[PDB]
Ligand binder design. Structure first.
Ligand SMILES: Cc1ncc(COP(=O)(O)O)c(CN[C@@H](C)C(=O)O)c1O
Ligand SMILES: Cc1ncc(COP(=O)(O)O)c(CN[C@@H](C)C(=O)O)c1O
Lengths: 394, 394
């Protein structure tokens, strides 16, 4: 029945208003492969709103690996890994990932999102604590909400706040600290050296979400622990396959005893169907390419260094990024929606960040680089962004 | 740091004991496509533990549709539907599903699990209520736990308990009832006529999880509302693609205003990458086949009717199933593990249900039919199950 349900959704008017104003730019229907240019409404559009940092979703070797896995294994496994949904290739990918990030063991999940739900829901329980950076990804907040533990946010990269909040807690309790490696909003990197120094002092477990770090920082892109040399101080490395690795799914890697506990106790792996064969094979092939072909990471960072330099030269106000995410401040929700749609209509795709996710005065567009971007494409996009910022009176 | 973490996992010994006893049969690595026979350890094994009810994960047309989508769209969309992860084909599949289940609109999710997290987390909030059948799927309990509402379980298909618990609640509050359509443990069907009669009396929203119903019950397999004629009394129809539809992902269909609220407010769709092109195309092609080719559903039910008849004739104790899930009672965890492994070693794959998920005295194996099963295969499996139950002294 719909009476109260209709009242619950009645005040959600922003989409109706965006659409009526001709500003709506969510769920833009792409007609082509994710690439440096995409087709929308039959038009070519420069893509600066992707997470495919290495441009690998078009790599013919990865496509062929996926197509061959469809030929051999079919379209799906039709059950949880726990029961009838494990393939030899899922186990192969776990062993490969474990080697890549320097851990004993890994368990796959069908999404990155579910990869955070699993360890955050089941390791800390009643009388225990989870400590979260306040800017942690939504999947980390949700995973921690599924635990029976007490969840505590600390100030963004605020090690004094982290230390203070841990110091308060009963000694006879388990604690887990979970942090993004690279935070996606502002593109900044966790202070892992101090965070792990505090974790070591308080015997708290450390989990790092490397969704934006894998294929980006660390040796051969192995992520945030790898970038700092702190493999030995990080209990659990989580990653997704939907960004650099060009696929869908995720993992958690760690000590064989911890991973064996997760794979038999995490509801998001016991009660959800396993990764499709095609996504296992594309992740496997992408992982090989990232390590074997150093040029992809190198070119991502040449693009990043060039674009950031060009943006600061043109006087754009950037966030404190240390990554291929270039947050460009606009500081008005109305202007952020206008700039986003005007760019779309001039053939540039960027992602808006608005209230209520951020304060109006911190509203911004996110401009993300891919290894496959050319300097010519970057220059075109920035030329068009200078014009739209002028038109918009930012 | 690992001291307290090691203590949290220290008492989880069942896997170590199963493995040391030679009884472990979780995460069995399959080497071949999900089918009526699978290869494990280079041996052929009859598969009676699948959720691929129509056997479609091997359909060459569905494989080719997926391979063609890889060719056209690449290996992934590399972002949320909300931002850069929408394809024309995701929208096509939403329109197709909406038509199939008789609703205005649908939103895809990258897993079935996430399809329950979305509406349960974001529609009911503070001062509202979610009412859950006590046997609801784990993803429904977790989705409801992510809401800021008060979550209330009612007795399994206990309409007097449902009515009583609703009657207690403040009138000035929103209520949502969420139920599995077909419950996977015992294979039973929700009492949707009475549940919707109560929902209508109390103006409570109705959500049905049709993971095991789509491709199984209702006109041309359209699910539980379709089976009862109660499309008009069900607000939200959720489904997965990982069972009859031979793929990965899920959806929620409903009124265009409710679905537009979800697709902009559900964290599991705004903050998780979209379905892979290959899984969109396999779901599209599978959906066509289920409707165009009535023989698949017909043969599922001929197999179901035959196997259930043969099991009751041999004197097996079955659960109160109304579906292709044939729960066979064993009523000892030790015997359930022994029977499961002895079947595996004789070339039969079945799924155990044990403590702590059920009481020891309700432990069982689940024997699930596929349309592609032959009577000869069913007969072989039952002959082997009679022998193992004898060997096991059940
Ligand atoms: C009733 C029900 N709802 C929702 C889901 C989640 O759908 P996905 O597997 O597509 O995420 C399942 C999963 N079932 C299997 C996996 C199980 O519980 O073993 C289910 O049985
Ligand atoms: C830090 C972080 N962790 C985890 C996830 C979830 O991974 P999957 O998308 O593979 O489920 C994301 C998703 N990001 C994108 C989708 C976003 O938030 O728009 C993320 O940014």
């Amino acid at each position: 029945s719909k009476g109260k349900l209709g009242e619950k959704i009645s005040q959600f008017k922003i989409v109706e208003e965006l659409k009526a104003k001709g500003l709506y730019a969510y769920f833009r229907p792409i007609q082509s492969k994710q690439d440096t240019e995409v087709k929308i409404d039959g038009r070519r559009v420069l893509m600066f709103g992707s997470n495919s940092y290495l441009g690998l979703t078009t790599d013919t070797r990865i496509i062929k690996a996926a197509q061959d896995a469809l030929e051999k294994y079919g379209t799906g496994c039709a059950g949880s890994r726990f029961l009838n949904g494990t393939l030899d290739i899922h186990v192969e990918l776990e062993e490969k990932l474990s080697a890549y990030v320097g851990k004993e063991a890994a368990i796959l999940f069908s999404t990155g999102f579910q990869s955070n739900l699993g360890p955050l829901s089941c390791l800390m329980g009643r009388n225990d604590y989870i400590l979260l950076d306040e800017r942690d990804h939504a999947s980390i907040i949700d995973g921690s909400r599924l635990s029976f533990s007490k969840v505590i946010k600390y100030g963004h990269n605020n090690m004094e706040d982290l230390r203070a909040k841990l110091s308060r807690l009963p000694e006879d309790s388990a604690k887990l600290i979970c942090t993004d490696g690279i935070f996606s909003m502002e593109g900044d990197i966790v202070n892992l050296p101090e965070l792990t120094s505090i974790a070591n002092e308080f015997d708290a477990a450390v989990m790092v979400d490397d969704a934006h770090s894998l294929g980006v920082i660390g040796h051969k892109g192995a992520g945030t622990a790898s970038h700092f040399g702190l493999n030995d101080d990080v209990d659990l490395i989580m990653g997704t396959f939907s960004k650099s690795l060009a696929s869908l799914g995720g993992f958690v890697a760690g000590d064989a005893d911890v991973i064996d506990f997760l794979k038999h106790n995490a509801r998001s792996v016991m009660f959800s169907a396993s990764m499709t064969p095609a996504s296992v094979a594309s992740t496997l092939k992408a992982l090989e390419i990232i390590q074997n072909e150093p040029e992809h990471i190198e070119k991502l960072w040449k693009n990043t260094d060039y674009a950031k330099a060009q943006l600061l030269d043109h006087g754009f106000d950037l966030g404190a990024t240390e990554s291929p995410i270039l947050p460009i401040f606009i500081r008005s929700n109305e202007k952020t929606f206008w700039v986003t749609k005007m760019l779309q209509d001039d053939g540039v795709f960027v992602n808006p960040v608005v209230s209520p996710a951020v304060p109006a005065e911190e509203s911004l567009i996110r401009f993300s680089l891919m290894a496959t971007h050319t300097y010519d494409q970057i220059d075109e996009a920035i030329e068009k962004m200078v014009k739209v910022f002028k038109q918009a009176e930012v």
